[PDB]
Design an enzyme around this catalytic site. Structure first.
Site, short mmCIF file in Angstrom:
data_model
loop_
_atom_site.label_atom_id
_atom_site.label_comp_id
_atom_site.label_asym_id
_atom_site.label_seq_id
_atom_site.Cartn_x
_atom_site.Cartn_y
_atom_site.Cartn_z
N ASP A 1 43.16 -47.75 27.69
CA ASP A 1 43.14 -46.98 26.38
C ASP A 1 43.15 -45.53 26.39
OD1 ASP A 1 40.63 -46.56 27.49
OD2 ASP A 1 39.50 -47.62 25.76
N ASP B 1 36.16 -59.22 11.73
CA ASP B 1 35.58 -57.94 12.04
C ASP B 1 36.70 -56.93 12.48
OD1 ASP B 1 34.41 -55.69 13.17
OD2 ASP B 1 32.51 -56.84 14.14
N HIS C 1 30.30 -50.13 29.39
CA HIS C 1 29.27 -49.89 28.42
C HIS C 1 27.98 -50.53 28.45
CE1 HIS C 1 32.21 -47.30 26.49
NE2 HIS C 1 32.93 -48.16 25.95
N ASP D 1 38.89 -44.34 31.73
CA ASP D 1 38.86 -45.22 30.49
C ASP D 1 38.72 -43.88 29.49
OD1 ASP D 1 38.25 -47.94 28.93
OD2 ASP D 1 37.37 -46.24 28.19
N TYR E 1 44.76 -51.17 24.66
CA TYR E 1 44.61 -52.25 23.78
C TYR E 1 46.20 -52.26 23.11
CZ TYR E 1 39.79 -51.95 24.22
OH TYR E 1 38.72 -52.04 24.73
N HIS F 1 36.91 -44.11 26.62
CA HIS F 1 35.40 -44.00 26.40
C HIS F 1 34.55 -43.83 27.33
CE1 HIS F 1 37.77 -47.08 23.75
NE2 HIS F 1 36.86 -46.52 22.96
O1 TWP Z 1 37.51 -50.08 24.81
C1 TWP Z 1 36.38 -49.99 24.80
N1 TWP Z 1 35.49 -49.23 25.76
O2 TWP Z 1 35.66 -49.23 27.17
C2 TWP Z 1 36.00 -49.91 23.23
C3 TWP Z 1 36.92 -49.81 21.95
C4 TWP Z 1 36.39 -49.74 20.63
C5 TWP Z 1 35.17 -49.60 20.32
C6 TWP Z 1 34.74 -49.46 18.90
N2 TWP Z 1 34.11 -50.55 18.36
C7 TWP Z 1 34.35 -51.87 18.08
C8 TWP Z 1 34.01 -52.71 17.10
C9 TWP Z 1 32.73 -52.05 16.46
C10 TWP Z 1 31.99 -52.27 15.52
C11 TWP Z 1 31.19 -51.11 14.66
C12 TWP Z 1 31.43 -49.83 15.38
C13 TWP Z 1 32.34 -49.65 16.44
C14 TWP Z 1 33.20 -50.74 17.05
C15 TWP Z 1 34.08 -49.81 21.37
C16 TWP Z 1 34.62 -49.82 22.72
K K Z 2 35.90 -42.75 30.77
ZN ZN Z 3 37.58 -47.84 26.45
#
Ligand code: TWP
Ligand code: K
Ligand code: ZN
Ligand code: K
Length: 635
Positions: free
Chosen positions: A267, A22, A137, A174, A307, A176
């Site tokens: 990140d 994946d 998340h 972060d 990462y 995100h």
């Molecule tokens: O580091 C994080 N968050 O704090 C974070 C980093 C990257 C992703 C994106 N991503 C990972 C697998 C996948 C599958 C389908 C669509 C999107 C996807 C999500 C979260």
């Molecule tokens: K954030």
């Molecule tokens: Zn993140």
């Protein structure tokens, strides 16, 4: 009496991993954890931390933020083979499950609560938990974006329940958006959530309308949610510092949280394949530093994302260095936030203006190089009280001469002060010189405080001695009225003056704050500190800070002042107090030495003061771009 920094970590949390192909999940690897501890070990920082052990969060603790149904579904995953695990994963977005991940998630959660108990019981002053899987998340009934359980959500609810806390700040730096955390505290005004995050006008994951600056909370929680969307990549140290000075800290200090929790994802740092921002690791030494005057220092940093394995360890080490109170690195080349950032900063300020008395006036129109070493100083702080006075000192301070140092004072005397013979003044001058010699060139002493009698000769010798040291640049923070032997004509000196009588200011290397005295004084002074003084100081990038206080001085702000201004100049600050004051000298030394700071809790400042400050921003933001918190007007 709290002291030390917990480092909660356990290698078990690196024993779950992605088991099928994946490409979007590849990035989230066990090695993120092992790279991070090993970096802290290499730099001697893990050894300086009380290693509190991990525990599992109980089922009753998990239900604080999650649902019986979703917990029971996840509790079934350790019995699953790879096909079954792929199927369970696909019911959710951007997350994989492993036979061991429910196990580690319980540890990642328990580790966070261990950190909360240690900090709130005073067994440490602060701490950091190195956990996998991330938390921010996940929501009440779903896993999302590598997260299973919302570790930081747990911490605040737990700290609410078992310590009866009324105000908790969560800072999510972060890259995100921590939508799980926003959902959890949406209508809750006791947990103030600040997040910045890559948005790109909602094109970036998780692609949520709720992520924009317009979500301020719901119901009794409106104003206690703060999103700062980045709509372009490549954001820089100047963009992160602009977001702190003109959004987060103004709200954070008025809020006065009883505890601070950080979703610390890295990140957001240069080199990350998912964030694509441009902040150096050093920036995290200051993001930490700027928050530690909150809640008496009670800070719980909790790993989220990150990462690039290289950029990861560097930024962790900058965060822990600052947790242990080591000197902050100088940030060079700071200036204006870019145009997209000023747009976001200006939008959130405006929408929040109905809720915070720091933006209220806005509502009524009236691949990269290595960080350099940060070993803490031999002795952190040197005190020179009047001859005869001797109070007790924290474990890392010391009282104050030399023959070389004595020839200079004689040298200095015959050239510039022929008609002066007071053997007391001439002692101060010897102290200033010798204490500066130990700061500017020895990595032995960090900062100091010298009580002085005659101000003008003391300052002159302080300043001129520092410039030849060489100190390319000296920031001077002065509380008092009247002239001062300062030449702010070239680019080597910047003067901040806090006075009682206003003054038309011509020079642009100066910031003169006249605060109408009263009950207004403390609230307004600290708007100016975070809004004007810190952003100019940070762009100036001084080599040495010189604090000065005249005798007719009120005091309840100087600790925050002293603590924050140590983010400049690797913490090299010399403070000249005119006349002896047991309390002020005690407060100055306490702050200089790394001690925790007493909070302020509560007012709101007078408009004559806020208008005085915006005249100053208007007069200075073209020279000092970091002062800007609107987009520039184009011709
Ligand atoms: O580091 C994080 N968050 O704090 C974070 C980093 C990257 C992703 C994106 N991503 C990972 C697998 C996948 C599958 C389908 C669509 C999107 C996807 C999500 C979260
Ligand atoms: K954030
Ligand atoms: Zn993140
Ligand atoms: K909230």
């Amino acid at each position: 009496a709290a002291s030390g920094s917990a480092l909660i970590f356990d290698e078990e949390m690196s024993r779950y991993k992605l088991l099928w192909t994946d490409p979007e999940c590849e990035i989230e690897v066990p090695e993120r954890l092992t790279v991070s501890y090993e970096a802290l070990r290499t730099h001697g920082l893990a050894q300086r931390c009380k290693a509190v052990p991990v525990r599992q969060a109980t089922e009753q603790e998990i239900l604080l933020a999650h649902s019986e149904e979703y917990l029971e579904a996840v509790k079934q995953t350790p019995g699953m083979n790879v096909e079954e695990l792929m199927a369970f994963s696909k019911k959710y977005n951007a997350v994989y499950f492993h036979q061991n991940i429910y196990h580690c998630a319980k540890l990642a959660a328990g580790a966070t609560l261990q950190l909360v108990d240690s900090v709130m019981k005073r067994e440490v002053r602060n701490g950091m938990a190195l956990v996998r899987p991330p938390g921010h998340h996940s929501q009440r009934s779903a896993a999302n974006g590598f997260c299973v359980f919302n570790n930081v959500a747990f911490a605040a609810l737990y700290a609410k329940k078992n310590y009866n806390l009324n105000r908790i700040l969560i800072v999510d730096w972060d890259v995100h958006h921590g939508q799980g955390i926003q959902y959890c505290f949406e209508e809750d005004p006791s947990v103030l959530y600040f997040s910045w995050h890559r948005y790109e006008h909602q094109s970036f994951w998780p692609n949520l309308p709720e992520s924009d600056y317009s979500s301020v909370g719901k119901g009794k929680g409106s104003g206690f949610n703060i999103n700062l969307p980045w709509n372009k990549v490549g954001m820089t140290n100047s963009d992160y510092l602009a977001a702190f000075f003109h959004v987060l800290l103004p709200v954070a200090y008025e809020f006065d949280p009883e505890l601070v929790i950080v979703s610390a994802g890295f990140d957001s740092a240069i080199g990350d394949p998912e964030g694509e921002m441009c902040a150096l690791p050093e920036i995290f030494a200051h993001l930490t530093h700027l928050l530690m005057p909150l809640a008496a220092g009670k800070m719980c940093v909790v790993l989220e994302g990150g990462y690039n394995l290289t950029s990861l360890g560097q930024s962790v080490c900058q965060t822990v260095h600052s947790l242990l109170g080591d000197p902050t690195p100088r940030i060079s080349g700071l200036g204006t936030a870019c145009d997209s950032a000023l747009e976001s900063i200006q939008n959130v300020r405006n929408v929040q203006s109905s809720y915070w008395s720091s933006f209220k006036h806005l509502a009524q129109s009236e691949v990269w190089p290595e960080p350099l070493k940060r070993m803490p100083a031999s002795v952190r702080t040197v005190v020179v009280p009047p001859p005869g006075v001797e109070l007790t000192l924290p474990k890392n301070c010391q009282h104050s001469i030399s023959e070389s140092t004595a020839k200079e004072v004689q040298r200095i005397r015959d050239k510039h002060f022929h008609d002066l013979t007071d053997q007391n003044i001439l002692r101060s001058l010897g102290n200033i010189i010798s204490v500066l010699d130990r700061m500017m060139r020895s990595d032995e002493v960090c900062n100091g405080c010298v009580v002085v009698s005659d101000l003008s000769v003391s300052v002159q010798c302080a300043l001129q001695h520092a410039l030849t040291e060489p100190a390319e640049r000296v920031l001077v923070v002065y509380v008092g009225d009247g002239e001062l032997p300062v030449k702010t004509n070239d680019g080597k000196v910047f003067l901040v003056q806090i006075c009682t009588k206003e003054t038309e200011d011509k020079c642009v290397n100066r910031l003169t704050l006249c605060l109408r005295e009263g009950e207004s004084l403390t609230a307004g002074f600290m708007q100016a500190l975070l809004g004007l003084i810190l952003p100019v100081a940070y762009e100036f990038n001084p080599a040495l800070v010189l604090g000065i206080v005249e005798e007719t001085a009120l005091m309840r702000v100087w600790g925050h002042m002293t603590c924050l201004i140590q983010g400049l100049a690797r913490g090299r600050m010399l403070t000249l107090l005119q006349g002896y004051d047991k309390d002020l000298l005690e407060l100055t030394v306490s702050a200089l030495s790394g001690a925790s700071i007493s909070p302020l809790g509560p007012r709101a400042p007078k408009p004559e003061d806020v208008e005085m400050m915006e005249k100053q921003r208007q007069r200075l933001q073209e020279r000092w771009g970091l002062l800007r918190c609107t987009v520039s007007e184009s011709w």
